[PDB]
Design a protein around this ligand. Structure first.
Ligand SMILES: [Zn+2]
Ligand SMILES: [Zn+2]
Lengths: 45, 67, 32, 39, 42, 45, 60
């Protein structure tokens, strides 16, 4: 439901809150969430 | 980290002179002569290019986090 | 050739209209 | 490594500046020490 | 020969720091502990 | 009677028994290690 | 895999296209099956395949 990114091979995937925390293709134990889809605005100051 | 756009003290735009400065230094020109050739008169501007340390060339050596 | 190869008398003709030990030329990699 | 162009230029500048410093500073120190000796 | 200036002293110091480093004592002590000290303690 | 396991000794970074003693300059970047890091410390928890 | 009219073939995965099967394509497949004398998958078997894929895709 929510995307994730591996910490070594930078491979995108998704998890269903029941899979083991692991990259599907290289088996790394550290993954990162992906950026939000909301709008990000800055004041340029 | 990367060359500032404007000189802090007065506000002259020095962000477009980093590549030219490196090119001039490559040809053997001295630092003072290189800064003079870029028309940087005030020493407030000269310290911006003279004392800049380029750290982004070290941050770029790390493998990008996405693909 | 360079300024050194110029004749000393011709070098004397180069008059401003010497290095000092405490003004280094800037570096970027340092050493260690 | 495949270093970028800016990094290679900086390395060349650093080598040239190191050589020039090692020459000129030593020459100036040698010029000063003899004057301090004869005084 | 020729005289030794300050720049030569800094060349020697540069050689020192090129070989030793700044935290050489910590690493040397730990290497000594792992290589021989554990066996002798046993 | 053979190699019985008696414990685990923490390893000082950049020492002779550290994994970063080898790996040169290029691989030090792939492991997300700063080449300016000097070692001399342990990592506990 | 194998075409009905044609013979058995070993193919890699990327040969298949993500685009949906069109009406003339399915009609030609049916005509080839009739020429060979074969039938279509039963609706019960279609449901069994659908359940198998749904279980496999949502498995942990
Ligand atoms: Zn991975
Ligand atoms: Zn300025």
């Amino acid at each position: 439901g929510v995307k994730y990114t591996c910490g070594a091979c930078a491979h995108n995937f998704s998890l269903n809150k029941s899979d083991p925390v692991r990259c599907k293709e290289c088996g790394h134990r550290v993954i990162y969430k992906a950026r939000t889809k909301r709008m990000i605005q800055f004041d340029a100051r | 980290m990367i060359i500032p756009v404007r000189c802090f003290s007065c506000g002259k735009v020095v962000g477009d002179k980093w590549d030219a400065y490196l090119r001039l230094l490559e040809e053997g020109k001295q630092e003072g002569d290189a800064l003079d050739e870029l028309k940087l008169k005030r020493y407030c501007c000269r310290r911006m290019v003279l004392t800049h340390v380029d750290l982004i060339e070290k941050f770029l050596r790390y493998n990008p986090l996405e693909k | 050739l360079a300024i050194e190869n110029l004749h000393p008398d011709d070098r004397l003709l180069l008059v401003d209209p010497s290095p000092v030990f405490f003004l280094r030329r800037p570096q970027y990699v340092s050493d260690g | 490594v495949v270093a970028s162009k800016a990094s290679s230029s900086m390395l060349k500048i650093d080598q040239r500046n190191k050589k020039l410093n090692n020459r000129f500073i030593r020459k100036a120190e040698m010029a000063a020490v003899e004057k301090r000796k004869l005084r | 020969d020729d005289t030794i200036t300050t720049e030569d002293c800094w060349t020697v110091i540069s050689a020192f720091f090129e070989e030793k480093g700044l935290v050489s004592q910590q690493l040397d002590s730990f290497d000594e502990f792992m290589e021989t000290s554990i066996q002798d303690l046993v | 009677g053979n190699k019985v396991h008696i414990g685990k000794v923490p390893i000082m970074l950049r020492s002779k028994f550290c994994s970063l003693r080898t790996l040169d300059e290029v691989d030090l970047y792939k492991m997300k290690e700063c080449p300016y890091d000097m070692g001399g410390y342990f990592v506990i928890n | 895999v194998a075409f009905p009219n044609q013979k058995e073939m070993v193919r890699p995965l990327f040969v298949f296209s993500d685009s949906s099967i069109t009406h003339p394509e399915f009609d030609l497949f049916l005509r080839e099956l009739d020429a060979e004398g074969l039938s279509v998958m039963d609706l019960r078997d279609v449901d069994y395949k659908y359940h198998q894929l749904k279980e496999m895709s949502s498995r942990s």
